[PDB]
Amino acid sequence: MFRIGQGFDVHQLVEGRPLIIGGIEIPYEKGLLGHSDADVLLHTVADACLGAVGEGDIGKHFPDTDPEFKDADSFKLLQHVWGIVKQKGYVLGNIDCTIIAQKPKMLPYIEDMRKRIAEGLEADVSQVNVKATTTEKLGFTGRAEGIAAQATVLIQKG
Amino acid sequence: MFRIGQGFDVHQLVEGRPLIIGGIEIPYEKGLLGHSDADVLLHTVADACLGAVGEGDIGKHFPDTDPEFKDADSFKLLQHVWGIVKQKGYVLGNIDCTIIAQKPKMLPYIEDMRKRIAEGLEADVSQVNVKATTTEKLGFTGRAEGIAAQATVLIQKG
Amino acid sequence: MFRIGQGFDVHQLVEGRPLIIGGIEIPYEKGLLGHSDADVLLHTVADACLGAVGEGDIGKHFPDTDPEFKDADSFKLLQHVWGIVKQKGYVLGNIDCTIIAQKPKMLPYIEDMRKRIAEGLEADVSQVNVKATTTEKLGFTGRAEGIAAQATVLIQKG
Ligand SMILES: Nc1ccn([C@@H]2O[C@H](COP(=O)(O)O)[C@@H](O)[C@H]2O)c(=O)n1
Ligand SMILES: Nc1ccn([C@@H]2O[C@H](COP(=O)(O)O)[C@@H](O)[C@H]2O)c(=O)n1
Ligand SMILES: Nc1ccn([C@@H]2O[C@H](COP(=O)(O)O)[C@@H](O)[C@H]2O)c(=O)n1
Ligand SMILES: [Mg+2]
Ligand SMILES: [Mg+2]
Ligand SMILES: [Mg+2]
């Protein structure tokens, strides 16, 4: 028994905020805006996992209206989600993720995001892939108004 | 033994159309524009299903020019597609879907969508997940010009 | 055992380039811009396959700045990627792909695309699905500024 999940998220890039993607703080002059730390990649990972076990989405579990979510660490949120997945009787098969951003260049941070995600999913780094693509200056990600992310996850009984 | 499918669709939001998403009519002052009822989520689910079995996309079976597509009920189209899947030997593993819309708030209608999708795929509600995200006012969805959806499906022999 | 991968890519449409998609030259008045042939779909497929086995993305294996990338045949880049996948001990389960493009109409070239991708992944055509959608004239794909593609792949031990 295998189950699939998919996640998609978008956050605005703005002046007065830290950039945290995949649990890793990137030195940058813009960061992501949200109620929590706005880590678009960990929200997308969390969404894919919840999706795979039929448990809705991060908004159902950590709504904005509740200020426990306010400035929440999304790695801790992911850990809570992974708790739900474990309770269903699953472990990670593998995950594959895409950061969609014109800038910054994510390549130097990728290996540390893979480790961090793997730690949050209680898995080996070889089960976690993270990649990045621009949109060649097209669309809202192309004009650097925001950063999007996608993930697909395969989980299995264990 | 297993196959994966992925679907993506976009419809314009316009005055004077009903809003039908996931087979559920949602009261709102705009609806989706199409030749059919323009149920962007059911079109996405149908496309993921057809994708999983190597049968093309909804346009190969129900082109815009087919008089049957005009005002077609997308749930019925989904049933037709699911008959194709079943003839190939497959049943639903699980499906995970995302509505990409700035508004309306999808949350109250999610559980009815899940039940309707599950009925179309002859499956338990536990096998179906639907979630929603905005794009934080960015891009065409952020301007409420349209609604998009994505789905990933895992099917298995049965 | 099974592994999942997901790809996404975008290239700009510009005058005075061939349009090559899914390894097929499509006669058209614009083509895709890149250092390589800029085949957005074969890039997307390659990234999905690399993702499935935890090997990063095409830029970690075939960076922009590599002279062999300049005017590269993306079918040959796919065959190399597929080499890596086989080296890790996997074969194709199935793959589902979507071209996102306002124009041209892809339908006539879809069957030749499927055969080419199946050849690239050492698979039967029945394991490969290629679809197209527009975005109803919305966003960068809808204004014909570029073409995007998505792919989800399921690979299996063999
Ligand atoms: N159109 C929408 C968009 C989001 N939602 C829900 O609201 C939450 C907040 O969405 P955003 O994070 O995109 O603002 C989501 O996690 C989802 O639970 C909704 O119910 N309808
Ligand atoms: N924001 C980004 C975008 C792309 N990249 C890298 O650059 C490579 C090529 O990306 P583009 O072709 O999208 O520009 C990617 O495969 C990825 O390795 C990155 O490291 N950070
Ligand atoms: N560029 C495109 C876009 C769509 N199509 C086909 O047209 C059909 C309908 O596309 P839209 O509803 O996205 O316009 C699709 O289901 C696909 O069969 C195509 O052949 N080439
Ligand atoms: Mg988020
Ligand atoms: Mg549609
Ligand atoms: Mg490319």
Coordinates of C-alpha atoms and ligand atoms in Angstrom, one line a residue:
Chain A
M1 CA 0.0 0.0 0.0
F2 CA 1.4 3.2 -1.4
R3 CA -0.2 6.6 -1.4
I4 CA 0.6 9.8 -3.5
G5 CA 0.4 13.4 -2.5
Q6 CA 1.0 16.7 -4.2
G7 CA 1.6 20.2 -2.9
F8 CA 1.7 23.7 -4.3
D9 CA 2.3 27.0 -2.4
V10 CA 3.1 30.6 -3.2
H11 CA 4.4 33.4 -1.0
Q12 CA 5.1 37.1 -1.8
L13 CA 8.8 38.3 -1.7
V14 CA 9.0 41.5 0.4
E15 CA 11.6 43.9 1.9
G16 CA 11.3 43.5 5.6
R17 CA 11.5 39.7 6.1
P18 CA 13.9 36.7 6.4
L19 CA 14.1 34.2 3.4
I20 CA 13.7 30.7 4.9
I21 CA 13.2 27.9 2.3
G22 CA 13.4 24.2 3.1
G23 CA 14.1 25.1 6.7
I24 CA 17.3 26.9 5.7
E25 CA 17.8 30.7 6.1
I26 CA 19.2 32.2 2.9
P27 CA 21.1 35.6 3.2
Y28 CA 19.0 37.8 1.0
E29 CA 17.6 41.4 0.8
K30 CA 13.9 40.1 0.4
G31 CA 12.1 37.4 2.3
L32 CA 8.8 35.7 2.2
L33 CA 5.6 37.2 3.7
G34 CA 3.2 35.1 5.6
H35 CA 1.6 34.6 9.1
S36 CA 4.2 31.9 9.9
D37 CA 7.8 32.0 8.7
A38 CA 6.4 31.7 5.2
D39 CA 8.7 28.8 4.2
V40 CA 7.0 28.1 0.9
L41 CA 8.9 24.8 0.4
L42 CA 8.1 23.3 3.8
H43 CA 4.5 24.4 3.5
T44 CA 4.4 22.5 0.1
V45 CA 6.1 19.4 1.6
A46 CA 3.6 19.5 4.5
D47 CA 0.7 19.9 2.1
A48 CA 1.8 16.9 -0.1
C49 CA 2.1 14.7 3.1
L50 CA -1.3 15.7 4.4
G51 CA -2.8 15.2 1.0
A52 CA -1.3 11.7 0.7
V53 CA -3.2 10.5 3.8
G54 CA -6.5 12.3 3.1
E55 CA -6.1 14.9 5.9
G56 CA -6.9 18.2 4.0
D57 CA -4.2 20.9 4.1
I58 CA -2.1 23.1 6.3
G59 CA -4.9 25.6 6.6
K60 CA -7.2 23.0 8.2
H61 CA -4.5 22.2 10.8
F62 CA -2.8 25.6 11.3
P63 CA -5.3 28.2 10.3
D64 CA -4.2 32.0 10.0
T65 CA -7.0 33.2 12.2
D66 CA -5.3 31.3 15.2
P67 CA -2.2 33.3 16.4
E68 CA -0.4 30.1 17.6
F69 CA 0.5 30.0 13.8
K70 CA 1.8 33.5 14.1
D71 CA 5.6 33.4 13.4
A72 CA 5.5 29.5 13.5
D73 CA 8.5 27.6 12.6
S74 CA 7.4 25.6 9.5
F75 CA 9.9 22.8 10.3
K76 CA 8.0 22.2 13.5
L77 CA 4.7 22.3 11.6
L78 CA 6.1 19.7 9.2
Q79 CA 7.0 17.5 12.2
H80 CA 3.5 17.7 13.4
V81 CA 2.2 16.7 9.9
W82 CA 4.7 13.9 9.8
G83 CA 3.2 12.7 13.2
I84 CA -0.2 12.4 11.4
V85 CA 1.3 10.4 8.6
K86 CA 3.0 8.0 11.1
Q87 CA -0.2 7.5 13.0
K88 CA -1.8 6.3 9.7
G89 CA 0.8 3.6 9.5
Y90 CA 3.1 5.2 6.8
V91 CA 6.7 6.1 6.3
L92 CA 8.4 7.9 3.4
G93 CA 9.1 6.3 0.1
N94 CA 10.5 9.3 -1.6
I95 CA 9.8 13.0 -2.2
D96 CA 10.6 15.3 -5.1
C97 CA 10.3 19.0 -4.9
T98 CA 10.7 22.1 -7.1
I99 CA 11.4 25.7 -5.9
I100 CA 10.1 28.2 -8.6
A101 CA 12.0 31.5 -8.2
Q102 CA 13.9 33.8 -10.5
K103 CA 16.3 34.7 -7.6
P104 CA 18.2 33.9 -5.5
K105 CA 20.1 31.1 -6.9
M106 CA 19.2 28.1 -4.7
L107 CA 22.0 25.7 -5.8
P108 CA 24.3 26.4 -2.9
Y109 CA 21.6 25.8 -0.3
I110 CA 20.0 22.7 -1.9
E111 CA 22.0 20.0 -0.1
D112 CA 21.2 21.5 3.3
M113 CA 17.4 21.7 2.4
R114 CA 17.5 18.0 1.5
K115 CA 19.0 17.1 4.9
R116 CA 16.6 19.2 6.7
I117 CA 13.5 17.9 4.9
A118 CA 14.9 14.3 5.4
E119 CA 15.2 15.0 9.1
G120 CA 11.6 16.2 9.2
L121 CA 10.3 13.1 7.3
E122 CA 12.6 10.7 9.4
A123 CA 14.2 9.6 6.3
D124 CA 17.5 9.2 4.5
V125 CA 18.7 12.1 2.3
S126 CA 18.7 9.7 -0.7
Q127 CA 14.9 9.7 -0.5
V128 CA 14.6 13.5 -0.8
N129 CA 15.2 15.5 -3.9
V130 CA 15.0 19.3 -4.2
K131 CA 15.5 21.2 -7.4
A132 CA 15.0 24.8 -8.6
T133 CA 13.9 26.5 -11.9
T134 CA 13.3 30.1 -12.9
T135 CA 10.4 31.0 -15.3
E136 CA 12.8 32.9 -17.6
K137 CA 11.5 36.2 -16.3
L138 CA 7.9 35.4 -17.1
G139 CA 4.9 35.7 -14.8
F140 CA 4.9 36.8 -11.2
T141 CA 7.8 34.5 -10.2
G142 CA 9.7 35.9 -13.2
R143 CA 9.3 39.5 -12.0
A144 CA 10.4 38.4 -8.5
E145 CA 7.0 39.3 -6.9
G146 CA 7.1 35.9 -5.2
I147 CA 8.4 32.3 -4.9
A148 CA 6.4 29.2 -5.6
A149 CA 7.0 25.5 -4.8
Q150 CA 5.7 22.1 -5.8
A151 CA 6.1 18.7 -4.3
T152 CA 5.0 15.2 -5.0
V153 CA 5.5 12.5 -2.4
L154 CA 5.1 8.8 -2.3
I155 CA 4.5 7.1 1.0
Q156 CA 4.2 3.5 1.9
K157 CA 3.2 1.3 4.8
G158 CA 5.9 0.9 7.5
Chain B
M1 CA 0.7 -2.9 -11.1
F2 CA 0.5 0.8 -10.3
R3 CA 0.3 3.9 -12.6
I4 CA 0.5 7.6 -12.0
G5 CA -1.4 10.5 -13.6
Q6 CA -1.3 14.2 -13.3
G7 CA -3.9 16.8 -14.4
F8 CA -3.8 20.6 -14.7
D9 CA -6.6 22.9 -15.9
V10 CA -7.6 26.6 -15.9
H11 CA -10.9 28.3 -16.5
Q12 CA -11.8 32.0 -16.6
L13 CA -14.0 33.5 -13.9
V14 CA -16.8 35.6 -15.5
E15 CA -20.1 37.3 -14.4
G16 CA -23.3 35.4 -15.3
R17 CA -22.1 31.8 -15.1
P18 CA -22.7 29.2 -12.3
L19 CA -19.6 28.2 -10.3
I20 CA -19.4 24.4 -10.2
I21 CA -16.2 22.9 -8.8
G22 CA -15.7 19.3 -7.9
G23 CA -19.4 18.7 -8.9
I24 CA -20.6 21.0 -6.3
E25 CA -22.4 24.3 -7.1
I26 CA -21.0 27.1 -5.0
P27 CA -23.1 30.3 -4.6
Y28 CA -21.0 33.2 -6.0
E29 CA -21.3 36.2 -8.3
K30 CA -19.0 34.8 -10.9
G31 CA -18.7 31.3 -12.3
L32 CA -16.3 29.5 -14.7
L33 CA -16.5 30.1 -18.4
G34 CA -16.4 27.1 -20.8
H35 CA -18.3 25.2 -23.5
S36 CA -19.2 22.7 -20.7
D37 CA -20.1 23.5 -17.1
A38 CA -16.4 24.3 -16.9
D39 CA -15.8 22.4 -13.7
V40 CA -12.1 23.0 -13.6
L41 CA -11.5 20.4 -10.8
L42 CA -13.4 17.6 -12.4
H43 CA -11.7 18.3 -15.7
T44 CA -8.3 18.1 -13.9
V45 CA -9.3 14.8 -12.1
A46 CA -10.5 13.4 -15.5
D47 CA -7.2 14.4 -17.2
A48 CA -5.1 12.8 -14.4
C49 CA -7.1 9.6 -14.8
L50 CA -6.8 9.5 -18.6
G51 CA -3.2 10.3 -18.1
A52 CA -2.6 7.4 -15.8
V53 CA -3.8 4.9 -18.5
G54 CA -2.2 6.5 -21.5
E55 CA -5.5 7.7 -23.1
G56 CA -4.6 11.2 -23.9
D57 CA -6.7 14.0 -22.4
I58 CA -10.3 15.1 -22.2
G59 CA -10.0 16.9 -25.6
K60 CA -9.3 13.6 -27.3
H61 CA -12.5 12.1 -26.0
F62 CA -14.7 15.2 -25.6
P63 CA -13.5 17.9 -28.0
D64 CA -15.1 21.4 -27.7
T65 CA -16.7 20.8 -31.0
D66 CA -18.6 17.8 -29.9
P67 CA -22.3 19.0 -29.4
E68 CA -22.4 16.7 -26.3
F69 CA -19.7 18.8 -24.6
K70 CA -21.9 21.9 -24.8
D71 CA -23.2 22.4 -21.3
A72 CA -22.1 18.9 -20.4
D73 CA -22.1 17.9 -16.8
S74 CA -18.5 17.3 -15.9
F75 CA -19.4 14.6 -13.4
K76 CA -20.8 12.5 -16.2
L77 CA -17.6 13.1 -18.2
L78 CA -15.7 11.9 -15.2
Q79 CA -17.8 8.8 -15.1
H80 CA -17.1 8.1 -18.7
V81 CA -13.4 8.5 -18.1
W82 CA -13.6 6.2 -15.1
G83 CA -15.2 3.5 -17.3
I84 CA -12.1 3.7 -19.5
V85 CA -9.8 3.2 -16.5
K86 CA -11.9 0.2 -15.3
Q87 CA -11.8 -1.5 -18.7
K88 CA -8.0 -1.3 -18.5
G89 CA -8.1 -3.4 -15.3
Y90 CA -7.5 -0.5 -12.7
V91 CA -9.2 0.8 -9.5
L92 CA -8.3 4.0 -7.5
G93 CA -5.2 3.9 -5.2
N94 CA -5.7 7.5 -4.1
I95 CA -6.0 11.0 -5.5
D96 CA -4.8 14.4 -4.2
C97 CA -6.1 17.6 -5.8
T98 CA -5.5 21.4 -5.3
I99 CA -7.9 24.2 -6.2
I100 CA -5.9 27.4 -7.0
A101 CA -8.3 30.3 -6.4
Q102 CA -8.1 33.7 -4.7
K103 CA -11.8 33.4 -4.0
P104 CA -14.3 32.1 -3.0
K105 CA -13.2 30.3 0.2
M106 CA -13.4 26.6 -0.8
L107 CA -13.2 25.1 2.6
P108 CA -16.9 24.8 3.4
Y109 CA -17.5 22.8 0.2
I110 CA -14.4 20.6 0.4
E111 CA -16.1 17.6 2.0
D112 CA -19.0 17.6 -0.6
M113 CA -16.3 17.7 -3.3
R114 CA -14.5 14.8 -1.8
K115 CA -17.7 12.7 -1.6
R116 CA -18.6 13.6 -5.2
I117 CA -15.2 12.8 -6.6
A118 CA -15.1 9.5 -4.6
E119 CA -18.5 8.6 -6.1
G120 CA -17.2 9.2 -9.6
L121 CA -14.1 7.1 -9.0
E122 CA -16.1 4.4 -7.2
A123 CA -14.0 4.8 -4.2
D124 CA -14.0 5.5 -0.5
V125 CA -13.9 9.1 0.6
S126 CA -10.6 8.3 2.5
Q127 CA -9.0 7.8 -0.9
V128 CA -9.7 11.3 -2.0
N129 CA -8.2 14.6 -0.9
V130 CA -9.0 18.1 -2.0
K131 CA -7.3 21.2 -0.9
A132 CA -7.3 24.9 -1.8
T133 CA -4.6 27.6 -1.9
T134 CA -4.6 31.2 -3.1
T135 CA -1.5 32.7 -4.9
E136 CA -1.4 35.6 -2.4
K137 CA -2.9 38.0 -4.9
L138 CA -0.2 37.3 -7.5
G139 CA -0.7 36.4 -11.2
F140 CA -4.0 35.7 -13.0
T141 CA -5.5 33.6 -10.1
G142 CA -4.4 36.3 -7.7
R143 CA -6.4 38.9 -9.8
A144 CA -9.5 36.6 -9.7
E145 CA -9.3 36.3 -13.4
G146 CA -9.6 32.5 -13.3
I147 CA -9.3 29.4 -11.2
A148 CA -6.8 26.6 -11.7
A149 CA -6.6 23.1 -10.4
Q150 CA -4.0 20.3 -10.1
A151 CA -4.4 16.7 -9.3
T152 CA -2.1 13.6 -8.9
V153 CA -3.6 10.2 -9.0
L154 CA -2.3 6.7 -8.3
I155 CA -4.2 3.9 -9.7
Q156 CA -3.7 0.1 -9.2
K157 CA -4.8 -3.2 -10.7
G158 CA -8.0 -4.4 -9.2
Chain C
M1 CA 9.8 -0.6 -4.8
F2 CA 8.6 2.4 -6.7
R3 CA 9.8 6.0 -6.8
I4 CA 8.0 9.2 -8.0
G5 CA 9.4 12.3 -9.7
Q6 CA 7.9 15.6 -10.9
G7 CA 9.3 18.1 -13.4
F8 CA 8.4 21.6 -14.4
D9 CA 10.0 23.9 -16.9
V10 CA 9.4 27.1 -18.9
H11 CA 11.0 28.7 -22.0
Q12 CA 10.2 32.0 -23.7
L13 CA 8.8 31.9 -27.3
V14 CA 10.8 34.2 -29.6
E15 CA 11.1 34.9 -33.3
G16 CA 13.8 33.2 -35.3
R17 CA 14.2 29.8 -33.5
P18 CA 13.0 26.3 -34.4
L19 CA 10.1 25.1 -32.2
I20 CA 11.2 21.7 -30.9
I21 CA 8.9 20.1 -28.3
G22 CA 9.0 16.4 -27.2
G23 CA 11.9 15.9 -29.6
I24 CA 9.7 16.8 -32.6
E25 CA 10.3 20.0 -34.7
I26 CA 6.9 21.7 -35.1
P27 CA 6.7 24.2 -38.0
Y28 CA 5.9 27.6 -36.4
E29 CA 6.8 31.3 -36.6
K30 CA 8.4 31.3 -33.1
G31 CA 10.6 28.8 -31.3
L32 CA 11.8 28.4 -27.8
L33 CA 14.8 30.3 -26.4
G34 CA 17.7 28.6 -24.7
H35 CA 21.4 27.7 -25.0
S36 CA 20.3 24.2 -26.0
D37 CA 17.4 23.4 -28.4
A38 CA 15.2 24.6 -25.5
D39 CA 12.9 21.6 -25.7
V40 CA 10.8 22.4 -22.7
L41 CA 9.0 19.1 -22.6
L42 CA 12.2 16.9 -22.8
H43 CA 13.8 19.1 -20.1
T44 CA 10.7 18.6 -17.9
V45 CA 10.8 14.8 -18.5
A46 CA 14.6 14.7 -17.7
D47 CA 14.0 16.7 -14.4
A48 CA 11.2 14.3 -13.3
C49 CA 13.4 11.3 -14.0
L50 CA 16.4 12.9 -12.1
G51 CA 14.1 13.8 -9.3
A52 CA 12.7 10.3 -8.9
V53 CA 16.3 8.9 -8.1
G54 CA 17.5 11.8 -6.0
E55 CA 20.0 13.2 -8.5
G56 CA 19.1 16.9 -8.5
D57 CA 18.1 18.5 -11.8
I58 CA 19.4 19.0 -15.3
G59 CA 21.5 22.0 -14.2
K60 CA 23.5 19.9 -11.8
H61 CA 24.4 17.5 -14.7
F62 CA 24.3 19.7 -17.8
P63 CA 24.8 23.3 -16.7
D64 CA 24.2 26.3 -19.0
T65 CA 27.9 27.1 -19.0
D66 CA 29.0 23.6 -20.3
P67 CA 30.0 24.1 -24.0
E68 CA 28.4 20.7 -24.8
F69 CA 25.0 22.2 -23.7
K70 CA 25.2 24.9 -26.4
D71 CA 22.7 23.8 -29.2
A72 CA 22.4 20.4 -27.4
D73 CA 19.9 17.9 -28.6
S74 CA 17.6 17.5 -25.6
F75 CA 16.8 13.9 -26.7
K76 CA 20.5 13.1 -26.2
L77 CA 20.4 14.9 -22.8
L78 CA 17.4 12.6 -21.9
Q79 CA 19.2 9.4 -23.0
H80 CA 22.1 10.4 -20.6
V81 CA 19.7 11.1 -17.8
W82 CA 18.0 7.8 -18.4
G83 CA 21.5 6.2 -18.2
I84 CA 21.7 7.5 -14.6
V85 CA 18.3 6.1 -13.7
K86 CA 19.2 2.7 -15.1
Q87 CA 22.5 2.8 -13.3
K88 CA 20.5 3.3 -10.0
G89 CA 18.6 0.0 -10.9
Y90 CA 15.2 1.3 -12.1
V91 CA 13.1 1.1 -15.3
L92 CA 10.0 3.1 -16.3
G93 CA 6.6 2.4 -14.7
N94 CA 4.8 5.2 -16.6
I95 CA 5.0 8.9 -17.2
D96 CA 2.3 11.5 -17.6
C97 CA 3.2 14.9 -19.2
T98 CA 1.3 18.2 -19.9
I99 CA 2.4 20.9 -22.4
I100 CA 1.0 24.3 -21.4
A101 CA 0.8 26.4 -24.5
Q102 CA -1.8 28.8 -26.0
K103 CA -0.4 27.9 -29.5
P104 CA 0.5 26.0 -31.5
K105 CA -2.0 23.3 -31.4
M106 CA -0.1 20.2 -30.3
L107 CA -2.6 17.4 -31.0
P108 CA -1.2 16.6 -34.4
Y109 CA 2.3 16.1 -33.1
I110 CA 1.4 14.4 -29.9
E111 CA 1.8 10.8 -31.1
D112 CA 5.3 11.4 -32.5
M113 CA 6.1 13.0 -29.1
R114 CA 5.1 9.9 -27.2
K115 CA 7.1 7.7 -29.4
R116 CA 10.2 9.8 -29.0
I117 CA 9.8 10.0 -25.2
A118 CA 9.2 6.2 -25.0
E119 CA 12.4 5.7 -27.1
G120 CA 14.2 8.0 -24.6
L121 CA 13.1 6.0 -21.6
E122 CA 13.5 2.6 -23.3
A123 CA 9.7 2.0 -22.8
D124 CA 6.6 1.0 -24.7
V125 CA 4.5 3.9 -26.0
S126 CA 1.7 2.6 -23.8
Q127 CA 3.7 3.8 -20.8
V128 CA 3.9 7.3 -22.0
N129 CA 1.2 10.0 -22.1
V130 CA 1.5 13.5 -23.4
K131 CA -1.3 16.1 -23.2
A132 CA -1.7 19.7 -23.8
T133 CA -3.8 22.5 -22.3
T134 CA -4.1 26.2 -22.8
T135 CA -4.6 28.6 -19.9
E136 CA -7.6 30.2 -21.6
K137 CA -5.5 33.2 -22.6
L138 CA -4.5 33.9 -19.0
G139 CA -1.0 34.5 -17.7
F140 CA 2.3 34.3 -19.5
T141 CA 1.4 31.1 -21.4
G142 CA -2.0 32.6 -22.3
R143 CA -0.4 35.7 -23.8
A144 CA 2.0 33.4 -25.8
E145 CA 5.1 34.7 -24.1
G146 CA 6.3 31.2 -23.3
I147 CA 5.5 27.5 -23.1
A148 CA 5.5 25.5 -19.9
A149 CA 5.5 21.8 -19.2
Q150 CA 4.9 19.4 -16.3
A151 CA 5.6 15.8 -15.9
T152 CA 5.1 13.2 -13.2
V153 CA 6.9 9.8 -13.5
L154 CA 6.7 6.6 -11.6
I155 CA 9.8 4.4 -11.8
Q156 CA 10.2 0.8 -10.5
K157 CA 12.9 -1.7 -9.7
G158 CA 14.0 -3.6 -12.8
Ligands
LIG1 N1 -9.7 29.7 -2.4 C1 -9.2 29.1 -1.2 C2 -7.9 29.2 -0.8 C3 -7.5 28.7 0.4 N2 -8.3 28.0 1.2 C4 -7.9 27.5 2.5 O1 -7.3 28.6 3.2 C5 -6.0 28.3 3.6 C6 -5.2 29.6 3.3 O2 -4.8 29.6 1.9 P1 -3.5 30.5 1.5 O3 -2.4 29.9 2.3 O4 -3.3 30.3 0.1 O5 -4.0 31.9 1.9 C7 -5.5 27.0 2.8 O6 -4.6 26.2 3.5 C8 -6.9 26.3 2.7 O7 -7.0 25.6 3.9 C9 -9.7 27.9 0.8 O8 -10.5 27.4 1.5 N3 -10.1 28.5 -0.4
LIG2 N1 16.3 30.0 -8.5 C1 17.1 29.0 -9.1 C2 16.8 28.6 -10.4 C3 17.5 27.7 -11.1 N2 18.6 27.1 -10.4 C4 19.5 26.1 -11.1 O1 19.7 26.5 -12.5 C5 19.4 25.5 -13.4 C6 18.8 26.0 -14.7 O2 17.6 26.7 -14.3 P1 16.8 27.6 -15.4 O3 17.0 26.9 -16.7 O4 15.4 27.6 -14.9 O5 17.4 29.0 -15.3 C7 18.4 24.6 -12.7 O6 18.4 23.2 -13.2 C8 18.9 24.7 -11.3 O7 20.0 23.8 -11.2 C9 18.9 27.6 -9.1 O8 19.9 27.1 -8.5 N3 18.2 28.5 -8.5
LIG3 N1 -1.8 24.0 -27.2 C1 -2.8 23.1 -27.1 C2 -3.7 23.2 -26.1 C3 -4.7 22.2 -26.0 N2 -4.8 21.2 -26.9 C4 -6.0 20.2 -26.8 O1 -7.1 21.0 -26.7 C5 -8.0 20.5 -25.7 C6 -8.6 21.6 -24.9 O2 -7.7 22.5 -24.5 P1 -8.1 23.8 -23.5 O3 -9.4 23.4 -22.9 O4 -7.0 23.9 -22.5 O5 -8.1 24.9 -24.5 C7 -7.1 19.7 -24.7 O6 -7.8 18.8 -23.9 C8 -6.1 19.2 -25.7 O7 -6.7 18.0 -26.2 C9 -3.9 21.1 -27.9 O8 -3.9 20.2 -28.7 N3 -2.9 22.0 -28.0
MG4 MG 2.5 28.8 2.7
MG5 MG -11.5 22.5 -18.4
MG6 MG 14.6 24.0 -19.9

